[PDB]
From a paper:
Local resolution analysis indicated that the heterodimeric 2×(HhH)2 domain exhibited some mobility, so signal subtraction of this domain was carried out followed by local refinement. This process improved the global resolution of the resulting sub-volume to 3.6 Å which enabled building, refinement and validation of an atomic model. The cryo-EM structure of near full-length XPF–ERCC1 reveals a compact conformation with extensive interactions between the XPF HLM and CM modules. The two RecA-like domains form a rigid platform and lack a nucleotide cleft characteristic of many ATP-driven helicases. While RecA1 caps one edge of the HLM and engages the XPF nuclease domain in the CM, the helical domain caps the other HLM extremity and engages the CM and the dsDNA-binding ERCC1 (HhH)2 domain. The XPF helical domain forms a contact with the XPF nuclease domain that sterically prevents the ds/ssDNA substrate from reaching the XPF active site. A key contact within this auto-inhibited conformation is between sidechains of H275XPF and S730XPF. A second autoinhibitory interface exists between the XPF helical domain and the ERCC1 (HhH)2 domain. This interface is formed through predominantly polar contacts involving the highly conserved T248ERCC1, T252ERCC1 residues and both S312XPF and T316XPF. The structure of DNA-free XPF–ERCC1 reveals how the heterodimer is auto-inhibited by blocking both DNA binding and active site access through contacts with the XPF helical domain.
XPF–ERCC1 recognises double-stranded/single-stranded (ds/ss) DNA junctions which have a 3′-ssDNA overhang, nicking the dsDNA backbone to produce a substrate for subsequent steps in DNA repair pathways. The smaller ERCC1 subunit has no catalytic activity but is structurally related to the XPF CM, consisting of a nuclease-like domain (NLD) and a dsDNA-binding (HhH)2 domain.
Numbering used by the authors:
A (entry chain G): 100 to 295
B (entry chain F): 9 to 362, 366 to 440, 551 to 641, 680 to 906
Write the structure that this text describes.
Amino acid sequence: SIIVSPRQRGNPVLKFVRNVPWEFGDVIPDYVLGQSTCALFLSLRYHNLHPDYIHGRLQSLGKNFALRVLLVQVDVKDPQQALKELAKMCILADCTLILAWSPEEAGRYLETYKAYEQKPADLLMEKLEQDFVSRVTECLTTVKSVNKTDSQTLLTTFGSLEQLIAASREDLALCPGLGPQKARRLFDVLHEPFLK
Amino acid sequence: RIAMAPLLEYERQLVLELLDTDGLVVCARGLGADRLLYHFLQLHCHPACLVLVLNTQPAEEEYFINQLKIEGVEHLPRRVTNEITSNSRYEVYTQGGVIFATSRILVVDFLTDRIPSDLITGILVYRAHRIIESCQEAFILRLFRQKNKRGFIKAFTDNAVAFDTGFCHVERVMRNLFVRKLYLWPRFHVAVNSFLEQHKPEVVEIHVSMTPTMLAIQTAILDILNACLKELKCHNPSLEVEDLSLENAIGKPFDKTIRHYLDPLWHQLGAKTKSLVQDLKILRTLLQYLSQYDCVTFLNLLESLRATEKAFGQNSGWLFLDSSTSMFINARARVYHLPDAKMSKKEKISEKMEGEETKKELVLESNPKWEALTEVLKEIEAENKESEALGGPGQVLICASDDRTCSQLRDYITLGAEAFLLRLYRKTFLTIIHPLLGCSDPYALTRVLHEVEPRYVVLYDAELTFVRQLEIYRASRPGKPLRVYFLIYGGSTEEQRYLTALRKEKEAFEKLIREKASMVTQQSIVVDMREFRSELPSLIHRRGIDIEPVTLEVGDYILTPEMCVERKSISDLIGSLNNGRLYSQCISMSRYYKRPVLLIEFDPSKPFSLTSRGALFQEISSNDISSKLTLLTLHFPRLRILWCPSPHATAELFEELKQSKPQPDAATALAITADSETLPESEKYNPGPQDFLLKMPGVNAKNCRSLMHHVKNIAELAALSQDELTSILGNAANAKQLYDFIHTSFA
């Protein structure tokens, strides 16, 4: 239920939304996204035309909503100045600057901000850590430089930690493409005394 | 008489030029460039003067230290490391002398200004090719040039290939190293050839023709590599120089060009090229594996490549391991015979049909290097024997590339030829030999060379660096001519690898001479140690805002009492948004500091769109970078994002941002830390087993500390019973988990 305020009549972004229907309503920021999420849409070519248009509009919004969003769209080949101005003109007024590289990407942003109020499904880096081969490849890679593929080719020769812990240094030197240095490294690691 | 000792006349000139006017000397493939440095070190090594040697490595020290020690000079060079009790402890500088150092431990001392910069007399760089990329050294020098009066720099260096690389003009390296002149000195120079001819060692080049069944492996491996390189070239139009032709994919320095070309923005490549690069690496190590190792092991290695499909699927590709089956048949012929059956019966010839009960046996073959070696070592004993006492006893130090070869070669002579085929086949079902190369100390074989004066020397395929070292060994004029015996496979990879690279140097030095003949209230920012490896602190310091260095745990820079910046590029964003570590970082940053930001650096030439356009045209737009970015910004309302186009713009954006705010202080910035990690001196070898032992299933910090404090090493964890582990830990479920993990197979 996104609310698009009527000052976006001739705008090239409303044609590129597809997911959720929209509404027309006299709210002060232009795109109201559910609750406590307002957007503001600005192309940098318009910023070079009227330079006093963003700084006036920031004042009338105030501190109403809890998450404000300023998304800007770049289409000017010299962006190394206006971005450095807009960051300092946004930091003191508490917004969030999102850069969009093309008008089609604004459709994904406008839909993605609407259709998300979900749970933290990104937190656990160990989201797939519940299987045996994942545990051995997450345990063995703690040494200095041994990638996953050498752990695969170490798995498919013995399979057993009891067998791997009893092999000689020359017995572990039959490495397919690992090298003698990593073999000597792991042979020192897997048995060296902790204390003195 | 040790090492370079007395320098030969060709050297004597070079030292003369570099004692008056400073510059950088471009020597040629170990023609002795190292040696020069010995002479400088002894001369300035007196006690009351100092200089720093900039880019050494650990072991070399050892040889240099011991050699100069033999002469008996006092105040021998001292070495400084990170673990030296930090400031105050480094009082060695006052005491003076030559001092070795690492690139970092310096930068910190100079910035805090603890070292005396009044007294420092000069700087002797080494391995200058490394300074080509604008990294830590540049900072060490531009920081040094405040001793404008006395300080003298010098650039002994080698590896002429790097400078020859396109887009890295020497002048740029020249201007950075702060020296005026240039001293080329190659190995066709007019005064370095007339001396090295008066005494020359004799070669006895011997051509050894390879078997008719080796070419059937080699011309197939090169065809598969040639078919892989075009597919790498098509789906990546970026890399187009110095990594294109076949010539350059055979030599040893090929992976450095790929690791320089594909390390910026690795994580926007996809899934096709990321397997293809691994394919190219394993196909390059196959071509070296066959020649330097025995046939039995190679039949194993090619058969061990077949086993990473039936468990892991496309591990080493589904593209090349199910095409060109001539490799197998060549491979299969070496070790096992083909099927055989009959009974006076016509139309009786099959693939695998039983008369055919016994496993057919194919004789093992021997690569003719072993055969043509034993003519030379039986000639040379008679060249002894015939000489009797009159010639003298003589010694031979036959040499080989790698340690494992040395092992085999050792046995080929000790037991006998049929011994290996019997010994190897079983398991799977005077004369000193030292290896030529390693990540080991390069300054070693030379020690052995002076060690055992070799009358006759015999060399398995080797790289330039050795061959030339031997001519310099011809420094004693009267000594009988050491006779080297090259060995060459006729029309092969090692001869290609040798010849090309030799030509590569020849063009390389030449272009140089043509470039020599063409010349005629203040603020602060607390900086994190780990971040010094990037050009941004060298661009902050130019504008005037001063930098003080210490370690951190939460965020890269601290611009002001209430701000914290964590810089991440466009590839590390894609990485740390799918790996899942930025979410475990901002939860700490917003907890600790007031207003967290993050700085994203795109690139204005190639904008990655961060969205699949067709999936945006079709799907509901989930599981991308944009959706996971929006979901990150939705939770934190107080995060700020700063986009910046280039690392020259960040130095401007930083000085505009702290305009009227106070100055962040170092005090207690280290104090905030975080609450974890226990105590690290618990294990004498703490930095080894722990890292493993913690990732094991069934452990916690408390039980791990106790159990580690009880049992000795990680071997007996698989040996001791589960009852012992559940008694020493008092828990049953995680103990049974550990016993199930430590004792299992794969299925």
